[PDB]
Design a protein around this ligand. Sequence first.
Ligand code: MG
Ligand code: MG
Length: 329
Amino acid sequence: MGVRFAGVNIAGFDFGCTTDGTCVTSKVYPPLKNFTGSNNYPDGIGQMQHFVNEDGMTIFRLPVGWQYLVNNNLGGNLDSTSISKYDQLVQGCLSLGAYCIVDIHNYARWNGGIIGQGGPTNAQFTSLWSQLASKYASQSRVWFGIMNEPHDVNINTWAATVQEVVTAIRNAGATSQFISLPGNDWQSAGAFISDGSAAALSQVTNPDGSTTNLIFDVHKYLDSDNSGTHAECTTNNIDGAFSPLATWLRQNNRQAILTETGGGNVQSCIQDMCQQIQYLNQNSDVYLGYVGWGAGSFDSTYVLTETPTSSGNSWTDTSLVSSCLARKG
Ligand SMILES: [Mg+2]
Ligand SMILES: [Mg+2]
């Protein structure tokens, strides 16, 4: 009676990342309360506990900068401090019984260079994922979010890169986990088929030749330019994106997850987001879940905030989360 996974992005390890793939590591603001000893960074783990206990959520996405994980050492070993801090957020998510999406928030780029297309080589990128897969191989509820919002890349070359990553993840022993396949056009669900991403990514397989647990990863916003930067919503995305996608998915016996979606905490979005979510829930054979953007280190002033408010051991949700994303039933 609905998609399997409902949850939210717990952002902050990605603050300082821009759409060119530059992540300034000094600017991260991770949602771990005691990240520095001040004990007053945003309380991502406390948020997740509320989301799971009160709002029936079962998945969280944890955006993080590539540069952060390797401390700016392209192709290097994961930095022991960085991975130690990030893993605290990962384990907090997993401890709640949720699935946890590790999301490399890099737009298929490193400091302006496109992975495998002038920027880092495929090997420098698979090296990142091989290490993460090795770390998380024994934890089946870690979900490998290969890349956030590739855009303006050669989709044929990108699909090959994605294939190399999937191979690396499986060969490292992470054989049980879900793996995301992200396409072009900022992962837009609306362009996923028409821009050729669906076809190219459909060719990616596990070592055994199957496509088992390889899930198409799309994004879609509800404002006029599909940017998620305006408060008001202007579409429920059904005719333009999710109906054609459902049909395609179903005919091909494949599945997709919507890892970013959101809107203002206003009436237009309460209406449109609920229509969108309802359609996903009525097509839960092909849609595995939805993940709202965004909570974690975002606060009450962020236009798409989904961060709950703590008041005397009580949390209160934003209106869009409470009215549309939450599952209190
Ligand atoms: Mg609680
Ligand atoms: Mg677009």
